[PDB]
Every structure is written in C-alpha cells, then in structure tokens.
Design a binder for this molecule. Structure first.
Ligand SMILES: CCCCCCCCCCCCCCCC(=O)O
Length: 155
C-alpha cells in the first residue's frame, strides 16, 4: 500500500543511521586505548548516513497521522541507542584523551550534532500537529545526548 511505502522511506533512513550508530557503539565498547582512527571513522560514517537521510527526505510530502505514528517506535529506538553510545563514549574519555584524540572526538560530535538537529527539524516538519510535542521531545533527546558528549570532550 501507498501508506507503507510512504513511511518506508523514513524507516530506511532511521535504520541506516541506527546501523551506523551501532557500529560506533560496538567499537567504543571494544576500545581500551591506543589507535582510535577506526573509531573516529565510524563517527564520520554516522554523519554520512545523516546527510544521506537529509537528501532522501528533503522534499517528502507531509505524513498522515497514522504514518507519523509508525515512526515513534523507530525514533525511540534510535534515540535510546544514541544515548547509550554517547554514555559509552564518555566512559572512554580517559584513553581517548590520553591517546591525543580529545579534539578530534569533540569535532566529530559537533559535526554529528549539526547534521542531527537539521534532520530532526526536517522530520518534525513532516508530521502533523498532534505529533508536534512528541517530535520536540524526541528532537531534544538527541541534541541533549550529543551535547553531553561535546561537553565531556571539552577542556
Ligand atoms: C514521529 C517522530 C518524529 C521525531 C523527529 C525527531 C527525531 C529524529 C531523529 C534524527 C536522528 C539523527 C541521529 C544522528 C546521531 C549522531 O550523529 O550521533
């Protein structure tokens, strides 16, 4: 149906972003010190998925109420993942900063955040009024999580 096809573009974008966050999380968990370039690369892959999502969703028409409701679960999932990943990254501040990666991690998070807020506002512009409050809450979660990271890797 057209209804499933409509939401599927949004779902695929969220899935692609979630996959990139998951890879980043896996490598953060595995990291205890030394070379962090593959980890930094993973961070930049999240930016690319977010940029691809912006490009794919830019001109999408407004979602119906039931279409937009189908995105609540997917977004809550991605958000929980982001929150946990950032927490895990902050838990590795010692070895990252110690290995000289502090500035690069901060810069990656700032760039992630700029793309994330752009996408969160774009998706929020596609949902009808009843979802405006939850869309703001979900947008704020992402922004707040990334900001928590940026602060941790500041001096
Ligand atoms: C019905 C739901 C509407 C919600 C709209 C706002 C939330 C969209 C989520 C955007 C995901 C961007 C995540 C990038 C994370 C990162 O770079 O670390």
């Amino acid at each position: 149906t057209k209804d499933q096809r409509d939401v599927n573009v949004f779902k695929k974008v969220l899935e692609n972003i979630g996959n990139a966050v998951t890879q980043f999380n896996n490598d953060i968990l595995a990291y205890t010190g030394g070379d962090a370039n593959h980890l930094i690369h993973d961070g930049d892959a999240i930016i690319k998925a977010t940029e691809n999502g912006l490009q794919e969703l830019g001109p999408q028409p407004p979602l119906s109420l039931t279409e937009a409701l189908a995105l609540v679960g997917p977004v809550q999932g991605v958000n929980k993942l982001i929150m946990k990943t950032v927490d895990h990254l902050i838990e590795k501040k010692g070895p990252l900063v110690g290995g000289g990666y502090g500035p690069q991690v901060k810069a990656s998070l700032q760039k992630q955040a700029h793309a994330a807020v752009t996408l969160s506002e774009l998706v929020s512009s596609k949902v009808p009024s009843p979802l405006a409050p939850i869309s703001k809450q979900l947008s704020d979660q992402v922004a707040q999580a990334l900001q928590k990271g940026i602060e941790a890797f500041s001096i």
